[PDB]
Amino acid sequence: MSKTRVIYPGTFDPITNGHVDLVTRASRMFDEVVVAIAIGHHKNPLFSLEERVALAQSSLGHLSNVEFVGFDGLLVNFFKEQKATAVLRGLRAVSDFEYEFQLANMNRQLDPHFEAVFLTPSEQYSFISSTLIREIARLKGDVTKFVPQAVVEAFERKHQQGW
Ligand SMILES: CC(C)(COP(=O)(O)OP(=O)(O)OC[C@H]1O[C@@H](n2cnc3c(N)ncnc32)[C@H](O)[C@@H]1O)[C@@H](O)C(=O)NCCC(=O)NCCS
Ligand SMILES: [Mg+2]
């Protein structure tokens, strides 16, 4: 009966109503949730680590047991470093599902204490992909339904400096 600490890694580029759902749900059933933003040097994302954490903090800060960190390197090492109970992932589409197994099973080989636990989001957040949001945003489309308001504005400010 130690305290429990789940890591919720992602690139959050940007965070979406779906992510927010998942974190909220997780905060209700574990002691600490750590939103962990993957820096991803060699991944090349649309928003900076700083924009990404900011927008996250903006949508989930009102939860007292959620923290925000950037990390790179090996999730398994992050896991160890954070003395985590488990890693949180969401399940919705179907190709996600067999990679998620690879991930879980590979990481368990690297660290037998590793553990993945999966939530499902509200049915209304199941279609939403971060990728699909970027494409719609990128074409002056209305992503208000799919992402928090800070993110909407962030998209607009990205247009304002050319996009
Ligand atoms: C960034 C990681 C976690 C993968 O997540 P991804 O890049 O897909 O970004 P995203 O921000 O979309 O991820 C958030 C998580 O929530 C789920 N999710 C994503 N979008 C939604 C949504 N709209 N609704 C519900 N769930 C969602 C996903 O299944 C994912 O688990 C990955 O880069 C990572 O570091 N994982 C470890 C990878 C690994 O072990 N590699 C080998 C050494 S690290
Ligand atoms: Mg996504």
Strand ranges, E, within the chain: 5-10, 32-38, 66-71, 86-90, 116-119
* Residue 138, both tokens: 């990128």
CATH code: domain of residue 108: 3.40.50.620
Question: Taking a C-beta distance cutoff of 8 angstroms, is the pair 35, 65 a contact?
Answer: no
Question: Taking a C-beta distance cutoff of 8 angstroms, is the pair 100, 90 a contact?
Answer: no
Residue of 25, 58, 80, 92 with catalytic role: 92
Number of domains in the chain: 1
Strand ranges, E, within 13-163: 32-38, 66-71, 86-90, 116-119
One-letter amino acid of 70? G
Residue 59 labeled ligand binder: no
SS3 73: coil
Q: State whether the beta carbon of 115 lies less than 6 angstroms from ligand 1.
A: no
Q: State whether the beta carbon of 84 lies less than 6 angstroms from ligand 1.
A: no
Q: State whether the beta carbon of 10 lies less than 6 angstroms from ligand 1.
A: yes
> For the chain, how big is the Rg over CA atoms in Å?
16
What whole-number distance in Å separates Cα of residue 53 and Cα of residue 80? 22
Give this entry's resolution in angstroms. Answer: 2.9
What is the residue range of 102's domain? 1-163
What whole-number distance in Å separates Cα of residue 152 and Cα of residue 143? 7
